Symmetry: C3
Subunit: 163 residues, 3 copies
């Protein structure tokens, strides 16, 4: 059982009424697995602010997994990967590759995500794309090895079954 | 559409030891697509010369896409990736992975290409392998998402 | 005929808790190929000790290929990638990708290996995962292009 934080990165999340549907898509993928969503926040497309939350969640809250979504595109404003890399002690390129659906012949556009994956302290951090469909496919691609990955990073155990 | 620059990097080709037929393969791949070759150049495996052309096409000419080919192997002098990375604002690893044909059941020689992919200003730059065959397969691998990637980097639309 | 060094990185094996059977799997994969294992070493998950052997084999022994196994995972003690990367003149990301078995329909546990691949001087170095299964499967993935890669890196010819 691993504590997960979902961070939705966009300035559009501070412009009034809209339901964060990507957040919901992510929860669905995790449903049933050794995961418990212990945090959820919206943050602007401002590296300083993204880093403050990631820093807080890893260093103080001690979350096991942080799934950010959005800001990984080719647009000059998408700087989630850069902001994240600067906070990582080491990266896990294999997970970044899985999120791009490399060699799966599933969704070609998924290859454009610059999202990174890495560890800070005892917290695994993955940058998922910003659309509901994108975040969903990228997370489902890593799901099979996510519990094993988290057990190594966090040193915490997990049970193979329904939760 | 998008203006493209093709930069062939080869010591042998530059010194006239052999002819460049790779650009010919690249042109065919682009034919029929929202691309138009605005420039072509041949330089040796020398970072200083590779960069001069990259800066020129991106900063002066403002080309939308730069496709280099060659100098991405494991040979000591193959230094196109290093030269290119020095000029990029940010990289797009997904495209570099596509050019290495990652995922094929049969381990490809393409995996030996150290080519990178990235953005400088509003120009997308891709390092394709130097062989005609290699450059073709690598370019075809990215073609499906090339137009969209370019629209995102340049801001220009296509049809 | 390329000279190979096998470096096993394992706290347990170094402590003598359980013997190294991974080198056996590696040797079997290379059997029948233009390879001769000239050196074997066993060290714990300690960067200084890992670097010491890598420098000795690349700089003093002149080995052509170094295959390390172990210490590439996500556990806090796994630092083979860091220790290795810092000694490389250049990286060959395509080989690191092949070792992660990227592209399998079923997400592989190999995706959790942070092992790198690169060149130091005229020596090609690859970080394989630590289990017999892990090292075996990752090495089989790169085997098809290994002789070619070494010929380019070492300058030594190969049919």
């Amino acid at each position: 059982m691993f504590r997960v934080g979902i961070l939705t990165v966009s300035d559009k999340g501070f412009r009034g009424e809209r339901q964060d549907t990507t957040h919901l898509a992510i929860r669905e993928v995790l449903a049933g697995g050794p995961f418990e969503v212990a945090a959820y926040e919206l943050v602007p497309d401002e590296p300083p602010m993204i880093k403050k939350v990631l820093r807080l969640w890893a260093d103080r809250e001690g979350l096991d997994l942080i799934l950010t979504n959005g800001g990984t595109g080719l647009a000059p404003r998408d700087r989630t990967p850069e902001a994240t890399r600067e906070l990582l002690d080491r990266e896990v390129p294999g997970l970044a590759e899985l999120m791009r659906l490399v060699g799966l012949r599933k969704t070609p556009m998924a290859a454009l995500s610059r999202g990174v994956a890495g560890v800070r302290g005892r917290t695994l951090i993955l940058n998922l794309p910003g659309s509901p469909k994108g975040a969903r496919e990228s997370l489902e691609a890593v799901l099979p090895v996510l519990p094993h990955a988290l057990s190594l990073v966090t040193g915490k155990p997990w049970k193979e079954g329904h939760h």
